[PDB]
Amino acid sequence: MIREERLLKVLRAPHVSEKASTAMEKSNTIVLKVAKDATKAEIKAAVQKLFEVEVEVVNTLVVKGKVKRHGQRIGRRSDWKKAYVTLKEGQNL
Amino acid sequence: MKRTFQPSVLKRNRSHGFRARMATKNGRQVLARRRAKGRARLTVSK
């Protein structure tokens, strides 16, 4: 059983932006970064345990890294997955 | 004026894809030659 440690690694970081702020104040939902796989069930369990909050539903999407032109060279950013988590009437963070 | 190249990902992969080369020994030699030359792209990868 590695479910506990798995839940401690799916979550990577919160997402800060205008869309994130308006979603939180209006829809009571938090947007955060997750691992590349990060199935919806794992994200739901991780938020319930680590943040000790009740959740309703999770929506995930994959963001493709942009292609950047650094110096004389061309590079690409890494793809990452962000999840929208909808909390219930009781919210903490 | 219709030109010779009409792109299609499915046709490109099924014709010159990695698995297409490995099916026959001639394709395997094509991969072997390009590994020896050190080419970054072994085949047309989606």
């Binding site: 493709k64 292609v67 061309i74 690409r76 | 990902v9 990868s45 989606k46």
Partner: peptide
């Protein structure tokens, strides 16, 4: 560099 995910996204006509 190479993107490998040309999945189909057909919006309902």
């Amino acid at each position: 560099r190479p993107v490998y995910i040309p999945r189909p996204r057909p919006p309902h006509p």
